[PDB]
């Protein structure tokens, strides 16, 4: 019997800062126990200061990103070159996904950028279109390895202030872009050590008011 779905592995991570946002993803692409490519870009600049990644089955991932980029283009044509706000993009992506409710895009989609007040924004989608704004979200193969670490190191969960002994929580102080990138790199380094589908390279797209910037880092190739 023909199976229209496949698993291309990969792991992605979106983090929303105070006045910035990052969307990171490894560059390894796989089937079963084989490596297809050590560098196959997974996170994309979709224009209007929005970055996107659709992780899971790469064919559906590419199809969705392609259709969303197309939706940005037609939004400009139809509405006098108006900028597509991150919240509007998120709702649009829901309808793209739900359009195939009964034959879904087998991907876990994350977009990142800035909201209309200039604050950092990340949106997270399931395969069939349920979405939600979030501060922190890992997706893909090593998501279960990364999220608990982020709960602890970004949101300071289970961390209390010394001396008080469980009475006063550690305060939720804002992280800089340099601080976030450290946590992203350590998340992927750890994921690379303990997950076979994660490795080769890490590509991070950083979104600010100035635009979209890229950073690349090597990962272990075993």
């Amino acid at each position: 019997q023909f199976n229209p779905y496949g698993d291309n592995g990969g792991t992605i991570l979106g983090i929303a800062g105070e006045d910035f946002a990052v969307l990171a993803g490894d560059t390894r692409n796989i089937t079963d126990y084989s490596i297809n490519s050590r560098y196959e870009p997974k996170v994309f600049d979709c224009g209007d200061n929005i970055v996107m990644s659709a992780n899971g089955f790469a064919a559906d991932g590419d199809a969705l990103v392609k259709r969303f980029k197309n939706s940005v283009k037609w939004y400009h044509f139809d509405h006098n070159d108006k900028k597509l706000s991150i919240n509007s993009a998120a709702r649009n992506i829901q309808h793209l996904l739900y359009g195939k409710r009964f034959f879904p895009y087998y991907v876990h989609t994350i977009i990142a950028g800035l909201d209309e007040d200039g604050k950092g924004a990340v949106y997270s989608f399931d395969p069939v279109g349920s979405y939600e704004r979030e501060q922190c979200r890992a997706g893909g193969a090593a998501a279960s390895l990364i999220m608990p670490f982020l709960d602890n190191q970004v949101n300071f969960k289970n961390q209390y202030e010394p001396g008080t002994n469980g009475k006063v929580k550690k305060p939720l102080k804002y992280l800089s872009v340099e601080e976030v990138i450290k946590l992203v790199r350590d998340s992927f380094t750890s994921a690379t050590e303990r997950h076979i589908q994660v490795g080769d390279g890490l590509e991070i797209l950083i979104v600010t008011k100035d635009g979209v910037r890229k950073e690349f880092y090597e990962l272990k190739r075993d």
Binding site: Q1, F2, S34, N36, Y39, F57, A63
Partner: protein, 233 residues
Amino acid sequence: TQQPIVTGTSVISMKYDNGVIIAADNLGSYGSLLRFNGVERLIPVGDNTVVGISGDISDMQHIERLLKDLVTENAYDNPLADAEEALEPSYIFEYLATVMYQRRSKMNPLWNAIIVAGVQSNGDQFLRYVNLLGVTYSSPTLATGFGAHMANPLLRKVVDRESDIPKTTVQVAEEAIVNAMRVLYYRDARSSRNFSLAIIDKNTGLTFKKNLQVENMKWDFAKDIKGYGTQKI
């Protein structure tokens, strides 16, 4: 939904400093029966692109006709059909990739794995993969089926990353491809000794080599091997 009937095995390929090389054997298997021994699975499109196809042969012949039709259609009302508006590898691939994904989405796939190898107008090497699921990816070395498991490891020792491409000559690249084809003949039960090889170079153009054979094979050591454990005679 179907099942593949007459099938072609590995297609292997790699980038080198001035272009790309692609190769595939001339066998059309019918299950375990090695039915057809004169099947060309590398199909050139113009003088800048070679499409290598594995999997179902009837679907390959269909794809072969689509590409032939694509060249005809591109020439219509096109004074620059043999110049600025000629078919690029990237155009040919994107077309196939669209078709493959559409067909899988209708639950009626072209049961193939395809590698489009070529050189673009600006001299850039093009090498990208697409299969029955519409999955696509690019890499300095690409291979389908058994080639993925046995050829890629060998070809990756020559070009392990992007920076190794300018350091790799056409002689070294062709040598690695030819050695990989020998290894596949040793170890793939659905392979043949006869194969075709194509080189697309930005300077010397498309060189298509037919009727190549696997040679310099090691078998002499087989005489010393006796029994399956304890047997001496």
